[PDB]
Amino acid sequence: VFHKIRNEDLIFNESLGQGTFTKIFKGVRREVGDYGQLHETEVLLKVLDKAHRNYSESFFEAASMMSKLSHKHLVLNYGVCVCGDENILVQEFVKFGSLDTYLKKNKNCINILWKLEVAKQLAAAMHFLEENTLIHGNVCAKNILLIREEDRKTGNPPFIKLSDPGISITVLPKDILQERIPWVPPECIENPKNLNLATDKWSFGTTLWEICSGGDKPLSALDSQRKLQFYEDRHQLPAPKAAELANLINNCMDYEPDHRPSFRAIIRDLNSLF
Ligand SMILES: Cc1ccsc1CN(C)Cc1nc(N)nc(Nc2ccccc2)n1
């Protein structure tokens, strides 16, 4: 179970946006750290919409299972606030935020080597999840967090973490699942209970497409009916202009879930480039 954090020890500051049935805020947590030192720690606060309080179990169950698996590429969740009528996840505040926003802002300065490093780190996280037979279920660029930027001055590569799963697509409304095409795989549109480890290989492909596309969203021009038909006609995403990962993207976005490659094989493929 998550550590319970008192409402009295949390300060809510600015809204940073929204997710699926969630509102996101920056805040501060007062805590006692190592050696009894008092800290005021910047935190990211995810608030489940009170109207959708029925999704709270799913909201926190996935985050909890993943937080039981500590890993350098998985986000740190400090705990939860049962802040009265609010269900709140208290998460580390990552300095540079979501990768899709970062990709759009810095597209002119991100090259293939940067993209390759990030892809390898994401694949490393996903391999760890695969070995632990833990399904994430919402891999996407918005859920990749940039801990530190590349610094060619000191040779340091960028460093990323994968964020929490969110509400499970096994419980989300059908219309939300359709809007999440092409991250949600065809078999889960067919039946959300088909959620499987193979799901994350497909979404990883879509995320690689995002990483290579300057933060564009694939198929954003298609409404939900046209996204459904895209899967019905078994289309694949267009190659990114920077097409170095196009083959890997299409190999991961395989309409046959059993044919999607293991993350170990994906990592071997990534290492074989450049
Ligand atoms: C912020 C947000 C908006 C919709 S969803 C979501 C949460 N998450 C996907 C992104 C994130 N997570 C964490 N842990 N930290 C940050 N930092 C940050 C935020 C904003 C600006 C600069 C840096 N951003």
What CATH number corresponds to the domain at position 72? 3.30.200.20
**Pocket lining: 16 vs ligand 1, CB cutoff 6 Å:** yes
Taking every pair of Cα atoms in the chain, the longest distance, rounded to a whole number of angstroms, is: 61
CA 241 – CA 70 distance, rounded (Å): 36
The closest-lying atom of ligand 1 relative to the alpha carbon of residue 95 is 23
Quick check: is 71 in a domain?
yes
**Burial class for 100, CB neighbours closer than 10 Å (0-12, 13-18, 19+):** buried
**Pocket lining: 165 vs ligand 1, CB cutoff 6 Å:** no
Q: Which one, of 120, 121, 136, 104, lies nearest residue 203 by Cα?
A: 136
Quick check: is 174 in a domain?
yes
Domain containing 36 equals 7-92
For ligand 1, atom 11, the nearest C-alpha belongs to: 97
Pairing of strands 86-92, 77-83: antiparallel
Q: Are 125 and 261 in contact (CB under 8 A)?
A: no
Tell which of 92, 123, 151 closes a domain: 92
DSSP 165: -
- 127 and 258 fall within a common domain: yes
**CA gyration radius for the chain?**
19
CA 141 – CA 190 distance, rounded (Å): 24
24 CB-near residues (< 8 Å, 6+ apart): 15, 16, 17, 18, 44, 45, 46, 47
Measured in angstroms, how far is the CA atom of residue 147 from the centroid of ligand 1? 11
Quick check: is 2 in a domain?
no
Residue of 46, 93, 98 with the most ligand 1 atoms within 8 Å of its CB, for mutation: 98
Measured in angstroms, how far is the CA atom of residue 272 from the centroid of ligand 1? 32
**Pocket lining: 25 vs ligand 1, CB cutoff 6 Å:** no
- First-to-last alpha carbon distance for the chain, in angstroms, is 43
- 72 and 186 fall within a common domain: no
Total number of domains constituting the chain: 2
248 CB-near residues (< 8 Å, 6+ apart): 205, 208, 266, 269, 270
CA 82 – CA 92 distance, rounded (Å): 18
The closest-lying atom of ligand 1 relative to the alpha carbon of residue 96 is 23
**Pocket lining: 93 vs ligand 1, CB cutoff 6 Å:** yes
CA 56 – CA 265 distance, rounded (Å): 36
- 70 and 118 fall within a common domain: no
161 CB-near residues (< 8 Å, 6+ apart): 72, 73, 74, 75, 76, 94, 125, 144, 145, 147
CA 187 – CA 169 distance, rounded (Å): 12
| Resolution in Å, one decimal place | 1.5
- Tokens in use for 239? 């190659």
CA 251 – CA 189 distance, rounded (Å): 20
Following DSSP, what letter does each residue of 172-241 receive, concatenated?
S-HHHHHHTTTTS-HHHHH-GGG--HHHHHHHHHHHHHHHHTTTPPTTTTS-HHHHHHHHHTT--PPPPS
- 32 and 119 fall within a common domain: no
Tell which of 92, 125, 157 closes a domain: 92
Q: Which one, of 156, 169, 120, 119, lies nearest residue 141 by Cα?
A: 119
- 87 and 106 fall within a common domain: no
Quick check: is 1 in a domain?
no
- 139 and 78 fall within a common domain: no
Which amino acid is located at 177 in the chain? L
Task: Phi first, then psi: give them for residue 78, nearest 5 degrees.
Answer: -75, -35
- 150 and 255 fall within a common domain: yes
**Pocket lining: 24 vs ligand 1, CB cutoff 6 Å:** yes
Quick check: is 186 in a domain?
yes
**Burial class for 267, CB neighbours closer than 10 Å (0-12, 13-18, 19+):** middle
- 124 and 21 fall within a common domain: no
CA 266 – CA 274 distance, rounded (Å): 15
CATH of the domain at 188: 1.10.510.10
Quick check: is 267 in a domain?
yes
- 82 and 127 fall within a common domain: no
Quick check: is 74 in a domain?
yes
- 30 and 108 fall within a common domain: no
**Pocket lining: 44 vs ligand 1, CB cutoff 6 Å:** yes
57 CB-near residues (< 8 Å, 6+ apart): none
Method of elucidation: X-ray
Tell which of 75, 92, 109 closes a domain: 92
- 213 and 265 fall within a common domain: yes
- 144 and 252 fall within a common domain: yes
Following DSSP, what letter does each residue of 119-149 receive, concatenated?
HHHHHHHHHHHHHTT-------GGGEEEEE-
